[PDB]
């Protein structure tokens, strides 16, 4: 179906403890495929998925050089951000960047991204049009002017409409056995009495890929949003994800409740009940 490629940068300053750590992780959908860490013994782009390993030595050289130069770039950015925000040199600060492309089922660009954040706050983001910028404040507006003057948007768009979609297309073909395979959740309902009058119904989804899923409880066919306890989707460690949704129900009313499951690996949404 639809697929995404994203690279994630984190640059973290640590005054008194050496130069800022720079890390890059790259993903196709929910699959990590490459990493770089400047704190590695001999830092380089490293394969994290079997399907990327068949890129020749030139791929790795070029990708490694990109990250090594990025290490320097983001260290400068950190120094610059400090000046733009009148901050002291004694504090730790973080720059994050996300960028990448989404493609549709036919592999055409759906949309591009390139967003930066400073200390967890929006800094600057390429707009959806891939030709203008949104700056979060007067500090980011300085970077915007520099980037406007240097035609950075035009170079992002060249990448996003070309290399981004083409490499993602190649990765999807090479990893087609996994990247283009959806695993539907394994699902069950468990029953946990809290007290005499109340019981917990917990609806589980295990073993699914990708992470996107919807799990909801109904009572007499009515959504129980404000009553449902919903945990964050969590990795199992085998590429798959887990989720549950719980409700507290009155004793003897269990059959009024149904759990509803939507996942791209399921032809039709599932309906479950407690099965005593």
């Amino acid at each position: 179906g639809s697929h995404s490629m994203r690279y994630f940068y984190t640059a973290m300053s640590r005054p008194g403890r050496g130069e800022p750590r720079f890390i890059t992780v790259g993903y196709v959908d929910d699959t990590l495929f490459v990493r770089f860490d400047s704190d590695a013994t001999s830092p380089r782009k490293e394969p994290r998925a079997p399907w990327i390993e068949q890129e020749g030595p030139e791929y790795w050289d070029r990708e490694t050089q990109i990250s090594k130069t990025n290490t320097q770039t983001y260290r400068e950015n950190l120094r610059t951000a400090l000046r733009y925000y009148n901050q002291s040199e004694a504090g730790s600060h973080i720059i994050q960047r996300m960028y990448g492309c989404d493609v549709g089922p036919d592999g055409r660009l759906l949309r591009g991204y390139d967003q930066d954040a400073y200390d967890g706050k929006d800094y600057i983001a390429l707009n959806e049009d891939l030709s203008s910028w949104t700056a979060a404040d007067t500090a980011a507006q300085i970077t915007q002017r520099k980037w406007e003057a240097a035609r950075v948007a035009e170079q992002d768009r060249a990448y996003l409409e070309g290399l981004c979609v083409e490499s993602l297309r190649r990765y999807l073909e090479n990893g087609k056995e996994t990247l283009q395979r959806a695993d539907p959740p394994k699902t069950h309902v468990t029953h946990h009495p809290i007290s005499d009058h109340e019981v917990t119904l917990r609806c589980w989804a295990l073993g699914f890929y990708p992470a996107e899923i919807t799990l909801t409880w109904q009572r007499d066919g009515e959504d129980q949003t404000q009553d449902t306890e919903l945990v964050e989707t969590r990795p199992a460690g085998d590429r798959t994800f887990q989720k549950w949704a719980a409700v507290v129900v009155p004793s003897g009313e269990e059959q009024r409740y149904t759990c509803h499951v939507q996942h791209e690996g399921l032809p039709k949404p599932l309906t479950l009940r407690w099965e005593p």
Binding site: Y7, Y59, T73, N77, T80, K146, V152, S167
Partner: peptide
Amino acid sequence: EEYLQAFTY
């Protein structure tokens, strides 16, 4: 594949 975005803040 990445690209080198070389322009700083």
